[PDB]
Design an enzyme around this catalytic site. Sequence first.
Site, PDB file in Angstrom:
ATOM      1  N   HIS A 224       0.836  -1.336   0.068  1.00 51.21           N
ATOM      2  CA  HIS A 224       0.000  -0.067  -0.089  1.00 51.21           C
ATOM      3  C   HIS A 224       0.900   1.253  -0.017  1.00 51.21           C
ATOM      4  CE1 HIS A 224      -3.714  -2.008   0.000  1.00 51.21           C
ATOM      5  NE2 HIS A 224      -3.807  -2.561   1.241  1.00 51.21           N
ATOM      6  N   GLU A 228       1.934   3.850  -3.401  1.00 54.64           N
ATOM      7  CA  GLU A 228       1.348   5.402  -3.455  1.00 54.64           C
ATOM      8  C   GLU A 228       2.667   6.372  -3.463  1.00 54.64           C
ATOM      9  OE1 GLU A 228      -1.999   6.932  -3.781  1.00 54.64           O
ATOM     10  OE2 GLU A 228      -0.401   8.530  -3.384  1.00 54.64           O
ATOM     11  N   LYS A 231       3.882   5.924  -7.071  1.00 57.24           N
ATOM     12  CA  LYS A 231       3.063   6.743  -7.819  1.00 57.24           C
ATOM     13  C   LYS A 231       3.281   8.110  -8.011  1.00 57.24           C
ATOM     14  CE  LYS A 231      -1.592   4.958  -7.764  1.00 57.24           C
ATOM     15  NZ  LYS A 231      -2.361   5.189  -6.343  1.00 57.24           N
ATOM     16  N   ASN A 232       3.728   8.594  -6.737  1.00 56.43           N
ATOM     17  CA  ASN A 232       3.954  10.235  -6.599  1.00 56.43           C
ATOM     18  C   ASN A 232       5.255  10.290  -7.371  1.00 56.43           C
ATOM     19  OD1 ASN A 232       1.423  10.412  -5.415  1.00 56.43           O
ATOM     20  ND2 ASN A 232       2.382  10.076  -3.078  1.00 56.43           N
TER      21      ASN A 232
HETATM   22  C1  LIG Z   1       0.115  13.023  -4.194  1.00 55.36           C
HETATM   23  C2  LIG Z   1      -0.409  13.579  -5.515  1.00 55.36           C
HETATM   24  C3  LIG Z   1      -1.391  12.992  -5.821  1.00 55.36           C
HETATM   25  C4  LIG Z   1      -1.925  13.282  -6.909  1.00 55.36           C
HETATM   26  C5  LIG Z   1      -3.332  12.919  -7.552  1.00 55.36           C
HETATM   27  C6  LIG Z   1      -3.789  13.010  -8.746  1.00 55.36           C
HETATM   28  C7  LIG Z   1      -2.864  13.971  -9.594  1.00 55.36           C
HETATM   29  C8  LIG Z   1      -1.845  14.326  -9.251  1.00 55.36           C
HETATM   30  C9  LIG Z   1      -1.208  14.085  -8.010  1.00 55.36           C
HETATM   31  N1  LIG Z   1      -0.222  14.617  -7.715  1.00 55.36           N
HETATM   32  C10 LIG Z   1       0.504  14.253  -6.276  1.00 55.36           C
HETATM   33  C11 LIG Z   1       1.992  14.755  -6.308  1.00 55.36           C
HETATM   34  C12 LIG Z   1       2.763  14.103  -6.447  1.00 55.36           C
HETATM   35  C13 LIG Z   1       4.161  14.404  -6.363  1.00 55.36           C
HETATM   36  C14 LIG Z   1       4.278  15.848  -5.960  1.00 55.36           C
HETATM   37  C15 LIG Z   1       3.181  16.691  -5.889  1.00 55.36           C
HETATM   38  C16 LIG Z   1       2.000  16.128  -6.064  1.00 55.36           C
HETATM   39  C17 LIG Z   1       3.182  17.912  -5.561  1.00 55.36           C
HETATM   40  C18 LIG Z   1       4.159  18.620  -6.413  1.00 55.36           C
HETATM   41  C19 LIG Z   1       5.781  17.993  -6.493  1.00 55.36           C
HETATM   42  C20 LIG Z   1       6.307  17.981  -7.798  1.00 55.36           C
HETATM   43  N2  LIG Z   1       5.539  16.545  -5.948  1.00 55.36           N
HETATM   44  C21 LIG Z   1       6.540  15.883  -5.419  1.00 55.36           C
HETATM   45  O1  LIG Z   1       7.662  16.233  -5.114  1.00 55.36           O
HETATM   46  C22 LIG Z   1       6.296  14.569  -4.464  1.00 55.36           C
HETATM   47  C23 LIG Z   1       5.332  14.274  -3.537  1.00 55.36           C
HETATM   48  C24 LIG Z   1       5.095  13.156  -2.640  1.00 55.36           C
HETATM   49  C25 LIG Z   1       5.977  12.118  -3.132  1.00 55.36           C
HETATM   50  O2  LIG Z   1       6.030  10.816  -2.624  1.00 55.36           O
HETATM   51  C26 LIG Z   1       7.249  12.403  -4.035  1.00 55.36           C
HETATM   52  C27 LIG Z   1       7.350  13.289  -4.921  1.00 55.36           C
HETATM   53  O3  LIG Z   1       8.162  13.551  -5.952  1.00 55.36           O
END
Ligand SMILES: Cc1cc2ccccc2nc1-c1ccc2c(c1)CC[C@H](C)N2C(=O)c1ccc(O)cc1O
Length: 336
Positions: A224, A228, A231-232
């Site tokens: 889980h 997550e 994906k991020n």
């Molecule tokens: C957490 C999340 C859920 C989403 C859900 C739908 C669409 C876009 C999404 N985007 C994010 C998401 C992922 C990475 C990041 C951000 C948002 C904010 C901007 C930035 C570029 N960012 C990160 O740096 C980031 C955040 C969490 C993480 O585990 C890794 C990352 O690299």
Amino acid sequence: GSAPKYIEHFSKFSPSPLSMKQFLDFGACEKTSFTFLRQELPVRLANIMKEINLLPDRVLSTPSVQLVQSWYVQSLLDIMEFLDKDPEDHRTLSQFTDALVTIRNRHNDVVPTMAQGVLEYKDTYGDDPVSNQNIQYFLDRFYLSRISIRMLINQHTLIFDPKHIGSIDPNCNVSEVVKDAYDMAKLLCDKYYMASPDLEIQEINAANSKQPIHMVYVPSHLYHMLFELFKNAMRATVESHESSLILPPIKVMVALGEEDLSIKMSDRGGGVPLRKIERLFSYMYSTAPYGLPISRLYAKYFQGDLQLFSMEGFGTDAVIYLKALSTDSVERLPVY
Ligand SMILES: Cc1cc2ccccc2nc1-c1ccc2c(c1)CC[C@H](C)N2C(=O)c1ccc(O)cc1O
Ligand SMILES: CC(C)c1ccc(COc2ccc(CC(=O)NCCN)cc2Cl)cc1
Ligand SMILES: [Cl-]
Ligand SMILES: [Cl-]
Ligand SMILES: [Cl-]
Ligand SMILES: [Cl-]
């Protein structure tokens, strides 16, 4: 009906945190699991139900909340039936397992159901900081409560229908779960973007230079969270490098210490500024007309954490902190 009386009765007991060890040693002890579960599930149900009821009539009266409240009342009563039954009657046992299943299925949709209440509150009264701290306070607690109920229930139904002990792997290979979660995120990443970062994994076994890192854990909680996180990290990496060629790998490290097992996942997706990091964990500021917050709960659940720090213009690190020793892995449960 009796519900508010039962709720009052059982809300005077404190739920009882167990440890991984105590969780293992449980798994023919089906009489003993049952006699335990029939007090304790009501305790835990009572306690959270009591706390739902402290919510202002402006929240308390909305359809979402009232619906999930109806589920908890049925589940409590469902289990009440069994308070005066007979542990030696192997069909009393047989129909309690059935009963637990039906309960687990009554509740599958609380996450998006509650999400509706957040959404309605948000447009009904506003998205101010104070609203938000209360939503945060309430939902970390409620979802953590729920996570523990399913943990109880899954341990019973899986063991009472040899290596894995229901949902616990006493020899979980952490790299293995890392790679699996990665493979899956990479599959989705390739579908939606048709490019995807590679993976590097390094291990650091402090005490034991070259032994692969194993632990006692619930692997699906670990999947889980890793999922997550992958994906991020993929999203940001891919999207920050669309105009560019090179596409940096996602680098994971798994470190094993005297008390922590820690998993860092570093990416070069260009980051988040310090100010915007809290929101990523906020239920309200990230609901719009399982998530980071919920992954964090899973970590917190057995005395762990899950922390983010970014370097804006470069990337983000995400650490999962876990207790290494089974003895330190004890449920973190809220109480009324
Ligand atoms: C957490 C999340 C859920 C989403 C859900 C739908 C669409 C876009 C999404 N985007 C994010 C998401 C992922 C990475 C990041 C951000 C948002 C904010 C901007 C930035 C570029 N960012 C990160 O740096 C980031 C955040 C969490 C993480 O585990 C890794 C990352 O690299
Ligand atoms: C959907 C569920 C999770 C949900 C949605 C929304 C909320 C929000 O609950 C609030 C909002 C504001 C205040 C501040 C105040 O001034 N209160 C006055 C005292 N009543 C307190 C609470 Cl408990 C909780 C739970
Ligand atoms: Cl959950
Ligand atoms: Cl995606
Ligand atoms: Cl943080
Ligand atoms: Cl209080």
